[model samples]
Target chain A: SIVSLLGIKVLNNPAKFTDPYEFEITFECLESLKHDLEWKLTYVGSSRSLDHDQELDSILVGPVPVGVNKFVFSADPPSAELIPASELVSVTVILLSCSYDGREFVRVGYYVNNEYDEEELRENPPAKVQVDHIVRNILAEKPRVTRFNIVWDN
Target chain B: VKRAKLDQTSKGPENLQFS
Candidate 1:
């Protein structure tokens, strides 16, 4: 029999921020597995701590049999250094699997960018490009696609 | 404007997955 056991969800994605960054992580179980859910969260493009480590590893998120599970990650008492000065802060959440002798399973990563003021906005101008040019380019390079779900594709 | 263009560029390829 094939095993299917863990799932994860990001509550809000492409999360925006002005000061302290905050977000939630949720999980689910596909079967009756009883092992506690373990996850590792890492920060990229910023040098800050989440649970006291940029690459926080093996923290028990909750039990496998639990659903609607929620966990919070935040930078309390907002500080300048907590959010990168000119770069996007990305948080990667990895949900480790418990079956097949344990393995790395699914991952969801999102980013947070500090609000830009008028001065900074003017300094860094946005790119200008034609939509038609883009469409032509994509059409030039044909890409393979797939369906999101095939449960009914019997 | 720019965000909309960025999203438009991203939606297509990002949604693709090879079997």
Candidate 2:
């Protein structure tokens, strides 16, 4: 059996930043297993607060689960202060797993940025190229994310 | 000089905001 988890153990318990930072979820499968697992991970962090609202903005990347691999999806902050992860405000993690028995969803966890058991954004804030932002700025100039899903092997 | 003349013009708001 393979167990997958988000080992975001490096991020500070209460990360802080100046303007626009990145949040990341790096994953690892504890064991080796193979199956067709299609999953979608959506992230929502602080948007409002007592101290500051519109705290941060982010872009979501891939839930890349290919060939027993370790991958990371990053959310780059907006053109705003890097919101503390501690004031996480609101966070949710859900997992959907499937097997021959049936298809079902497993709610992994929920995290709220609060005084207790809360995390803050870190300074020297992890550097992010914010490729998505660059792409979006470019696409906004000429937008597109279209792709063909079908595949043919010769 | 007979009767081969007519006057026509667009009969709508001269200044308008469409849609």
Candidate 3:
């Protein structure tokens, strides 16, 4: 099926996040027409799951007028520590999906190598978990807020 | 034609990682 991408782009993000897991996903709506929308970030598949098999974060990205917008996703130390160890080494695919009303419109995925170096997995092996709990905690603690900045012509 | 503008801020929580 053909999917409609709402002109989403990766403006800024962490090369590698340590300590209190934090990152930013900034995108813009290139479409001329305005629409109410929602977005989410998910970890796709097993092995690299978060903590308890849960992998979806829904954010309110409503009324995206043609312009620049940004949202920050941060995890506290306690929550950060709960992240699966195996994921720290593995290249995890983070999916960002956008929806109109309640139905999914389009989805995009990005890869992140949890750790700084690719060979770090061999230096200090860490354990992995289900991820459901981690996902729950993250959402419960801090849901995302979409900030609309400036409007520009297409 | 006038350019459309959006001044709406997210309603619920602001943080994405936390609730």
Candidate 2 regions off by >4 Å?
A1-12, A17-68, A77-107, A115-154, B1-19
Ranking by lDDT: 3, 1, 2
Give per-residue CA lDDT, model 1, range A1-154, as digits (tens). 1223222333333233322233344434345444443444444433434444344333453333323334444332233343334343323222222222244444444433332334654356345311111100011122122112112101
For model 1, what is the alpha-carbon lDDT of residue B3? Answer: 8
TM-score of each: 0.36, 0.26, 0.44
In model 2, the fraction of reference contacts reproduced equals: 0.00
Candidate 2, residues A3-111, lDDT tens digits: the string is 3433332233233322122223333444333333232322234444444333222222233232333322222333324344323223322121212112322222234
Give the TM-score (vs. native) of candidate 1. Answer: 0.36
* Decoy 2 TM-score against native: 0.26
The lDDT per prediction is: 0.32, 0.27, 0.43
* Candidate 2 docking quality: incorrect, acceptable, medium or high: incorrect
Tens digits of per-residue lDDT, candidate 3, A95-153, equal 56655545665655555544433355446544653232222112212232233323332
In candidate 2, residue A54 scores what lDDT? 36
lDDT of 3: 0.43
Candidate closer to the true structure by DockQ (higher is better), 1 or 3 = 3
1 against 3, candidate with superior TM-score: 3
* Pick by lDDT: 1 or 2, better one: 1
